[PDB]
Amino acid sequence: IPIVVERAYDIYSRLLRERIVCVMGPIDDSVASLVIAQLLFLQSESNKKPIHMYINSPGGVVTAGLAIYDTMQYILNPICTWCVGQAASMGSLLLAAGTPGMRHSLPNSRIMIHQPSAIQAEEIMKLKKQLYNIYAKHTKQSLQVIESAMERDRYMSPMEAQEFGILDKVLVHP
Amino acid sequence: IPIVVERAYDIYSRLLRERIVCVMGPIDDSVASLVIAQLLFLQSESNKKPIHMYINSPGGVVTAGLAIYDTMQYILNPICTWCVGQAASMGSLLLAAGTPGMRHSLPNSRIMIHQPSAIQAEEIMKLKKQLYNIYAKHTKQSLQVIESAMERDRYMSPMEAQEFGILDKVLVHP
Amino acid sequence: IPIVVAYDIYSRLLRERIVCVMGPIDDSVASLVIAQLLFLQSESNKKPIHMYINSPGGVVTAGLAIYDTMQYILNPICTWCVGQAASMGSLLLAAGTPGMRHSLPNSRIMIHQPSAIQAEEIMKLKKQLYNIYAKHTKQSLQVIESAMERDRYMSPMEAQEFGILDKVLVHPP
Amino acid sequence: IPIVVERAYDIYSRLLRERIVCVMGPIDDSVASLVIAQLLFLQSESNKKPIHMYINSPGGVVTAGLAIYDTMQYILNPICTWCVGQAASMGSLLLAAGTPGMRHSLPNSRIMIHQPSIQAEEIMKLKKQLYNIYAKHTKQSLQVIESAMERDRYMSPMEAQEFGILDKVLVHP
Amino acid sequence: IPIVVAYDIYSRLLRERIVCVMGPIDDSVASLVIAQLLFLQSESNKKPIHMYINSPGGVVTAGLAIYDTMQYILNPICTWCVGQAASMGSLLLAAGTPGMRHSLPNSRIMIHQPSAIQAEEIMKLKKQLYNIYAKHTKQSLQVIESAMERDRYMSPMEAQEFGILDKVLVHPP
Amino acid sequence: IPIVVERAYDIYSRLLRERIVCVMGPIDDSVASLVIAQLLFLQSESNKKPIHMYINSPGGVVTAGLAIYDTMQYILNPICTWCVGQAASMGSLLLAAGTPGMRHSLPNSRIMIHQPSAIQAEEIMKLKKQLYNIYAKHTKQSLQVIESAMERDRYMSPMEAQEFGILDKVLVHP
Amino acid sequence: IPIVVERAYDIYSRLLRERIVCVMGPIDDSVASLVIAQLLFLQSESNKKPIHMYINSPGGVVTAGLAIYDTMQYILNPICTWCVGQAASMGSLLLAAGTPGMRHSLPNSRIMIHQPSAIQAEEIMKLKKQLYNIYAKHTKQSLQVIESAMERDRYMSPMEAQEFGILDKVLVHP
Amino acid sequence: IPIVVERAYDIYSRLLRERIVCVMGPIDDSVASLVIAQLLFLQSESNKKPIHMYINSPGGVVTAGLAIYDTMQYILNPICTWCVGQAASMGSLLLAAGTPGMRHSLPNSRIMIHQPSIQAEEIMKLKKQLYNIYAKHTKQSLQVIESAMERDRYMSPMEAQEFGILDKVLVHP
Amino acid sequence: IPIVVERAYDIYSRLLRERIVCVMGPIDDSVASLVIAQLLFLQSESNKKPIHMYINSPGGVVTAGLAIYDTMQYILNPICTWCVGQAASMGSLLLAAGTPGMRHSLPNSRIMIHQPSAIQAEEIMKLKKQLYNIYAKHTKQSLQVIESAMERDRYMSPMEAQEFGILDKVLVHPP
Amino acid sequence: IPIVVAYDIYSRLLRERIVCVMGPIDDSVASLVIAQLLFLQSESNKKPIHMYINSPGGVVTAGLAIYDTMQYILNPICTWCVGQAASMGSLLLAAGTPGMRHSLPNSRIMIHQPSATIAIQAEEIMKLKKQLYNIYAKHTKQSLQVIESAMERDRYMSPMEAQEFGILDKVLVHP
């Protein structure tokens, strides 16, 4: 990982200085802990300067993704979400959880809300319903529209995602 | 692990200077030794200022969880416990052992006191009864209610765990 | 391992004169524990050292090397058990200074030994353990021998009654 | 496995023709199914002729050993148990479960009723089933069985005879 | 395994009343050797059995199970060592009928034992071996004990002098 | 393994009915037990008819080679040894231990008496001297000539091994 | 492997009844022992009925291949060799070792005399020279022509092999 | 590995500043190179100040242990050897090679000169080098060293003192 | 790796500051590139000052051994070779390749010039003959003598290696 | 890796304008060698650059990337072979600037390519081989047919034979 200088930082530390938090790759408890630590640090530096979440994630552990979601809801800051590459499963929940008006995608990204695939059947569906309710709330779709949509094994383009309510804006340049 | 200026710390060192101790992931002896060392250290800086324990944990080794528990009870400081993600098995014992009035969860966490399925049968039950007595004391439920509940292979929402006495506050914002 | 203020937290512990024995005891754990005991003795021959024990046991000869160093140095040694002290773990707990052997209340202590050398050597080593435990608990050889045959754990108060430790502590005295 | 002629038979088939069932090596569901099939087979050939069970086992899966134990008790035949090598844990339960007066060991065998090492309550429910079985067939009290089982040790055939696990120690026919 | 005239060659050996003990001894080797000894006894209680031993040793309790069966049956047993008889191998060689323990001239014999159970059990097993070896070599316990401490092999003639075997054979007598 | 009619045998059973014993590949205890069983069996069919041992072997376990050797010396039969391919280490000891006048090789075989580089140092040398004495006896070379030759990490042609006394006849045709 | 009937044989046993010996695949000591056993059996059934060796082999252990060669030279029978697929390294030596006039190849086979790639440098070259001398003898080329040719890492077609003297005949139908 | 301050030093660097060289765990070429580098370094700082070698080793590669032995003999410094835990095989050779009067053990250590378990002649040439080294430093005859080394056993520090491997058994400074 | 004292260094760096280069363990291309880098650096610091090479090795890759050899011959510096533990196969070639009069062993070392047992047969012999010519040259023995001693799978003591020409002095203590 | 005075020793070599090509060539080695060559060119596009080669070969496309970078930069490039230069290693050796390609005396050089690459179609493997034929022809000044016949031969050359063939200019013992 390369070093940059004005002051020396490895490049990911330099991104944190810009108020950017990276969510790349599968989400597990360790990624969630490092993402949460950064969200709370950046709020500490300022309650109202926007925070940017870069998402390129195929998904990951549901409870770890919900821990990130709950922290995003908890801090006061506007949070801008940006999808590069893809946002599948828990990645798309975090993308849709950004501050309204500030959820973005680059033009070739792929977005999926279908969930892939130790605990009991009652617990798996309780978690499933929590996802149904988060998605309904942030997309402004009905529970039934969410449930039928998550049953489809397929990706959407940024513009379909925009029309469904996961995203507000599709980019190309600044 | 990103670096943050304040004066250059990795972000987990910065959490500790905020008096936050992280309990993420399975508990084993090496997790316990690190958590204990940090609790004693924060006590030595100040025996009055509260300490905050952040818990996202599926449980782990019982004796190592009991070492953390005993240290929490030993130090003078008030201890605020916070659940994000999940607090299951020993994770939820540590959450319930926070200072009364100061046990919290974020809204989408999942809490389980049922214990997961080399020592003798007498020893396994002796440990199990040590857990029954700890949970009964911090929830103020009777031993028989703790015993029947832990037989249920379940998971509870934050609001149920509040009513049961595992925690005090379910918060969404500051 | 976090950094405190510059100091990684385990080096800060050593600055308090705390030596940690967490986990299976083998030769390199023993080499590090011994290095630390001799270092702390050279800082002050008389100031107490604190040994934090959370351990399932380990290699007998490595255990006896730590034991021999503990008896060698001039310092008083406070032992503290958290979590557990099983097998060689509990030998090191029992070997602290008379009056300064402690446990927190939910610890489990065991002196039974779990199940390459000849049979005569295994028995010689076993009798060295019987003699060490008899000396520091003040029990007879026969009592130690019969107790070590029972595959069970003791609570802190029962270990206190048997003579493995002196005090079960809930809060700071 | 060599063949013996009389008709051609592998040697283990010859033994079963002798009314001998072998319980060798760890007990698991597979072993239990084969042992049970053989006990039931021999009963259907005659529910009066004795059945011989040859045991050389370190033990194994408790529920699999209980399945064999129950079948032994269910069939009408007298059952002679013979210990060669060792009978440890479930091994020694099956040996002690033979028909009274018909439980034997060769002279250099080792016998252990200590058990080695699913939810905590279920582990003790199973252990209680073993205490009740050992008490019934040895005629010791429950308290004597429990103390004996926490001792991590083997017995000689003569000690196991005194305790009630066996009736006879042999040398020759 | 070739076929001779119908008979695989190892079954033809059993027809000569030869039982092979080749290789590490474990519980299934012992179960097969015992099955064969009892089979051959039922063919003729009095006809000699021949035991071919080429073995580095193995599990002690499995070894003692074969030993106990050898002493149990009525038959005389000729032991023959080819290649080697180490540890439990050499116990079974020494345990043949007095006068009928043999070796070919380039065999190596060892009674030293190589280097999960408690230390007391390992010593009990070791003393059972001392008593077996003392009985069949006619040496005192002290002599057996000192010899087993030496990590070395003996030639056939030295094993003959020590009492492990009776005859070193080059050609058919 | 093909089957041949004569009355249906696999071809290795047919070799045995011709009084041929195969010693192919590394020698270990299980090879030795099978070779010994066949030598005794062929002796029991007839103590006078020659037995033929076919050897293509890089050597193997010393004690197992010595068991075969001792059996060869024990039985009454003349034994013809034949080397094709190679006879190295214990393989070449068995070749040299054939009945005098009846040791052969095919033309392109390679023969080595040098020994390849858990027991004590005294035991390893005791075994080594047992081999020195066996080779000296069947080649009728002196102990010191056998000792220096075996130090040479070499391989010899059939004609050299004839001159050294390892074998008697090098044949191309009947 | 399927069974055929007039009399039941697995198909490879039926091939042996036709006096066909298969050398397929890499040549090691085990293949050589089974090939040798069959060559000697078939001579036993008849001293002068031709034997057929089918070769599709990338090569293998040199000493094991020389053991097969020496047996082919030893038996009295005419031996017809047939190459299908390929004959590389030791496979091509066995192909060229057939009775003159009776070495054949199907039209798409590939033939290589280049040798691919524990013993000392002196031994590797002694073996190499044995191959040089066998190839020179059966191809009627000079040692120098063989040595320079084996240095070329390349396959020949059946007709080049015919012209070089490895083969006598290239087929297409009976 | 914790840091100690005076300047920052990992604890093993602090020990070397004390003129202490650690020989822990198996001896191989890597360990030997580091030990040798340290002995030579300490000599260059002073060829008179004693060097202390702390040994807790089951042994290891003979030639690597001989490299250390030769360096120990080569440097001019007095060398104090200290055994904690165990000194077995090459371990015990290095312990016995300390400067006379300066060879120590803690009280519960175990010491073995039996060696555990390339061409046969070369294995004995090496073993002969070890016999000569042990005879020189213990002052026993070659015949006494050879018989002692074939016994598969450990000695206590007091026995090893009688034999000439050590001079002093300690408890405290 | 322990640390030693201005300035502080790991002990292997401190060795190089003394002009000591270590060849411990099996010789492969990366060991050779490191030893070579160290030889050429030491030559640039002083072209005339001796370099010391410490050898405890069982041998290794021949071409990598020869690459060290050629560098040792290339530099202007005198090179003292020291054998502790063992110098086998390529290790003993490097030991013999030190400056005449400066090749040493401690007393209990074992020395072996026998080579242990993908390239063609002709290349293996080409490389073996290069080893014969290097050993002949630095021991002052004939080719035939070197060829016959290398067929023997044995080790030499320091004193027989001395008599054979592989080294000059067996030392027990400093001078 | 030892420190010289702070400076790990491989960084000290880069300060001498030496670039090391040790061991097998793959994309990561090529990236690091290219980075170093362009670095040294930016320090001075006239001071010679030194490539040390001890290599059995490696991935063709990654060798060709180094070759093209050597040809692209302006500096004179001296190539030095120690140990061996096989397959893509010998291409790089031969690609140094004329008059400046060297070998130490016991090196082994091979232009035969071993029987690497993602697996590829038959026409692509031959297209690559013909790229290597051309590069070797241009720098050895041999005709394509001599190059082709020579690479068919599975063998190593000595340095003096490599010098006659046009792969290197100078074989040397000392400086």
Ligand SMILES: C#Cc1cccc(CN2CCC3=C(C2)C(=O)N(Cc2ccc(Cl)cc2)C2=NCCN23)c1
């Ligand atoms: C897992 C988790 C989690 C997620 C959302 C909220 C909380 C509640 N927690 C509860 C407690 C708490 C909080 C916030 C806080 O944001 N800060 C300031 C701070 C934090 C981190 C850094 Cl690096 C710098 C500054 C804080 N300083 C003392 C306590 N405290 C948990």
Ligand SMILES: C#Cc1cccc(CN2CCC3=C(C2)C(=O)N(Cc2ccc(Cl)cc2)C2=NCCN23)c1
């Ligand atoms: C395992 C364990 C364990 C758990 C709970 C209590 C104790 C008792 N122990 C007993 C001894 C003791 C203690 C507290 C202590 O809290 N501090 C101050 C300190 C500690 C760590 C750090 Cl990083 C900084 C400051 C202390 N300084 C000397 C001894 N000592 C053990």
Ligand SMILES: C#Cc1cccc(CN2CCC3=C(C2)C(=O)N(Cc2ccc(Cl)cc2)C2=NCCN23)c1
């Ligand atoms: C293995 C071992 C071992 C265990 C217990 C005692 C001894 C004897 N040893 C014997 C020698 C000795 C000793 C003590 C000593 O404690 N110190 C001072 C010192 C040590 C380490 C550190 Cl970090 C700082 C200071 C010491 N300085 C020179 C010699 N020396 C061994």
Ligand SMILES: C#Cc1cccc(CN2CCC3=C(C2)C(=O)N(Cc2ccc(Cl)cc2)C2=NCCN23)c1
């Ligand atoms: C698992 C199990 C099991 C164990 C103990 C008793 C039963 C009850 N069972 C109940 C049913 C039953 C039984 C006996 C039986 O002993 N025999 C005769 C028989 C059995 C086996 C063989 Cl080989 C030959 C003959 C039987 N013939 C039909 C049904 N039947 C189960």
Ligand SMILES: C#Cc1cccc(CN2CCC3=C(C2)C(=O)N(Cc2ccc(Cl)cc2)C2=NCCN23)c1
């Ligand atoms: C484990 C074991 C064991 C070892 C030594 C003796 C005994 C006692 N056992 C005790 C019982 C017993 C025996 C002998 C017996 O030798 N035979 C005859 C028989 C056996 C096998 C074969 Cl193939 C052919 C014939 C026998 N027939 C019914 C019971 N019975 C155990």
Ligand SMILES: C#Cc1cccc(CN2CCC3=C(C2)C(=O)N(Cc2ccc(Cl)cc2)C2=NCCN23)c1
């Ligand atoms: C291991 C071994 C061993 C090696 C060499 C000699 C002996 C002595 N032994 C001693 C005993 C003995 C022998 C020969 C014997 O050759 N035969 C005839 C026989 C054997 C095998 C087969 Cl298939 C067919 C026929 C024999 N029949 C009864 C006993 N017996 C051992």
Ligand SMILES: C#Cc1cccc(CN2CCC3=C(C2)C(=O)N(Cc2ccc(Cl)cc2)C2=NCCN23)c1
């Ligand atoms: C390895 C090998 C080897 C290769 C070439 C020749 C020999 C010499 N050998 C030497 C001895 C010998 C031979 C031939 C022989 O061809 N036959 C007839 C026979 C063989 C096998 C089968 Cl199935 C059927 C018939 C034979 N009958 C007794 C001895 N004998 C070895």
Ligand SMILES: C#Cc1cccc(CN2CCC3=C(C2)C(=O)N(Cc2ccc(Cl)cc2)C2=NCCN23)c1
């Ligand atoms: C392997 C090895 C080996 C073992 C025993 C003696 C020798 C001879 N060698 C011979 C050469 C030699 C020596 C000593 C020396 O002890 N020192 C001083 C020094 C060494 C190391 C450190 Cl870290 C600091 C200072 C020395 N400085 C230059 C040459 N040199 C080898």
Ligand SMILES: C#Cc1cccc(CN2CCC3=C(C2)C(=O)N(Cc2ccc(Cl)cc2)C2=NCCN23)c1
């Ligand atoms: C692989 C290799 C190799 C082996 C033997 C000789 C050469 C020739 N090479 C030829 C080129 C060359 C050389 C020497 C040189 O020794 N130095 C000075 C220097 C080198 C390294 C360090 Cl660390 C410090 C100083 C040098 N500076 C520019 C070119 N150059 C190679």
Ligand SMILES: C#Cc1cccc(CN2CCC3=C(C2)C(=O)N(Cc2ccc(Cl)cc2)C2=NCCN23)c1
């Ligand atoms: C893969 C590749 C590649 C290979 C050969 C040439 C080019 C073209 N490239 C084209 C671009 C380019 C080049 C050269 C350049 O040599 N330098 C100077 C520099 C480079 C590296 C370092 Cl570490 C320090 C200085 C340069 N500075 C900006 C752009 N640039 C590619």
